[PDB]
Design a protein around this ligand. Structure first.
Ligand SMILES: c1ccc(C[C@H]2CN(c3cc(-c4ccncc4)c(-c4ccc5ccccc5c4)nn3)CCN2)cc1
Length: 356
C-alpha cells in the first residue's frame, strides 16, 4: 500500500540539433541526428539511466490542427499500449513544459534500430531459416497487435526493423492515411496492400495484415515482389491471375456496385498452383502462403492460427506468444477541439510509467 504522491522533474538541457532546439533530460547524452530527415526529427542517443542506445523523436507541430492534434494523440496512445518484443514500444515520453499552458513539444523514446528488412535483404542472401524466423516474429507481433483489436494497415518491409541477430520489430503503424497519390503507379507503398483495401471493396478487418505478410513472405522466398503492379488495375490483375477471380460468395461481399460490375467484367480465371509458382520452396511454406493469400479475407488464416502452422514447428511455443491488454479506441469516434486533444495528450505524457 506504498504510493508515490509526486513526480521528480528531471533536469533538462537544451541544444540546437536538426536546425531546432532540442531540450531533453540530462540522462540522454550524445545526441546525433539520424535518418537524414527521413525518420523525421530523430536523434540517436545514449540513455545513461538504462545503458541503452536509443532513438529520440521530436514530434513537429503535433497540435497545429484538429486533425494533427488527434493524430498526435492517436500515436501516443498507440505507442504507450505496445508492450511486445516484436513491436515498437515506448521507453520514455516527455516534454520540457511544467504546465499545460506551456505545453508544446513532445519527445518520444525507443530502442535504436539499425536497419529495416529491405536493408537486410540488400546486404545478404537469406537462408530459409532466416525467412522462417523473420515471418515467425512478424506473426508473433501481429497476434499481439490483433488481440488488442488494432490493425496495422501498412505492413511492408520498410516498416519492419531488423537487427544483427535477425530479431525483428514492427513499427510505423498506418494509423492516419496514405495520400492516394503516394499510392499511385509503380510504387512499393501499394504492392503489399490487400485488394479489398486497395480498391475499397468493403470494410476491411485485421486480415488485411495477413495478406501483407503473405506478400512479404513470398518475396523473401523468391526475392521478387509478388504483385509489382504499375497501377491499381494492373496490380489487381496480377492478383486475380494468381488467386483466381472472385466467386459469387465474395462478390456479394463487395459493397460498391461499380466494383462488382468491374469484377464481373474480367474473364474468369482459376486459382494457380502455388507449387508451380513457388518452385523449389519448402512445401510447408507454400501451404501457408496459400492460406494467407486467399482473396476472401473472411477465409484467410489468422496470425494465431498461422503460428501453429507446421512451417513454424521449430519456433512455435504457445506459452511464449503473448496477447495484449484491452485497447480503448472510443476516442476515434469522438469529436473534440484542438485544445481538448492537446489536453488529453498532455495528460498521457505526464502519466507515463517507464517499463519495469
Ligand atoms: C532502422 C529501422 C527502420 C528504418 C526504416 C523506417 C524509417 N522510419 C522511421 C524510423 C524510426 C527509427 C526507429 C528506431 N531506430 C531508428 C529509427 C522512427 C522512430 C524514431 C524514434 C521513435 C521514438 C519513440 C517511438 C517511435 C519512434 C520511431 N520513425 N520512422 C519510417 C519507416 N521506415 C530505418 C532504420
Amino acid at each position: 500500500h506504498m504510493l508515490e504522491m509526486s513526480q521528480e522533474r528531471p533536469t533538462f538541457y537544451r541544444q540546437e540539433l536538426n536546425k531546432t532546439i532540442w531540450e531533453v533530460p540530462e540522462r540522454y547524452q550524445n545526441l546525433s541526428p539520424v535518418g537524414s530527415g527521413a525518420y523525421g526529427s530523430v536523434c540517436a542517443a545514449f540513455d545513461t539511466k538504462t545503458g541503452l542506445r536509443v532513438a529520440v523523436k521530436k514530434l513537429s507541430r503535433p497540435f497545429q490542427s484538429i486533425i494533427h492534434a488527434k493524430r498526435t494523440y492517436r500515436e501516443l496512445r498507440l505507442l504507450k499500449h505496445m508492450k511486445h518484443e516484436n513491436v515498437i514500444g515506448l521507453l520514455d515520453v516527455f516534454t520540457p513544459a511544467r504546465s499545460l499552458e506551456e505545453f508544446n513539444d513532445v519527445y518520444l523514446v525507443t530502442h535504436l534500430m539499425g536497419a529495416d528488412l529491405n536493408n537486410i535483404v540488400k546486404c545478404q542472401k537469406l537462408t530459409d531459416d532466416h525467412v522462417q524466423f523473420l515471418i515467425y516474429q512478424i506473426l508473433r507481433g501481429l497476434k499481439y497487435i490483433h488481440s488488442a483489436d488494432i490493425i496495422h494497415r501498412d505492413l511492408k518491409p520498410s516498416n519492419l526493423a531488423v537487427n544483427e541477430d535477425c530479431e525483428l520489430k514492427i513499427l510505423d503503424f498506418g494509423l492516419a492515411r496514405h495520400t492516394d497519390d503516394e499510392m499511385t503507379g509503380y510504387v512499393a507503398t501499394r504492392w503489399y496492400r490487400a485488394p479489398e483495401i486497395m480498391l475499397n471493396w468493403m470494410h476491411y478487418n485485421q486480415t488485411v495484415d495477413i495478406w501483407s505478410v503473405g506478400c512479404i513472405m513470398a518475396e523473401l522466398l523468391t526475392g521478387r515482389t509478388l504483385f509489382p503492379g504499375t497501377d491499381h488495375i494492373d496490380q489487381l490483375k496480377l492478383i486475380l491471375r494468381l488467386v483466381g477471380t472472385p466467386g459469387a460468395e465474395l462478390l456479394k461481399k463487395i459493397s460498391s456496385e461499380s466494383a462488382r460490375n468491374y469484377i464481373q467484367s474480367l474473364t474468369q480465371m482459376p486459382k494457380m498452383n502455388f507449387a508451380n509458382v513457388f518452385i523449389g520452396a519448402n512445401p510447408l511454406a507454400v501451404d501457408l502462403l496459400e492460406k494467407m493469400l486467399v482473396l476472401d479475407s473472411d477465409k484467410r488464416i489468422t496470425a494465431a492460427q498461422a503460428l501453429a502452422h507446421a512451417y513454424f514447428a521449430q519456433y512455435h511455443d504457445p506459452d511464449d506468444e503473448p496477447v495484449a491488454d484491452p485497447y480503448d479506441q472510443s476516442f476515434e469516434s469522438r469529436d473534440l477541439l484542438i485544445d481538448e486533444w492537446k489536453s488529453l495528450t498532455y495528460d498521457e505524457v505526464i502519466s507515463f510509467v517507464p517499463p519495469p
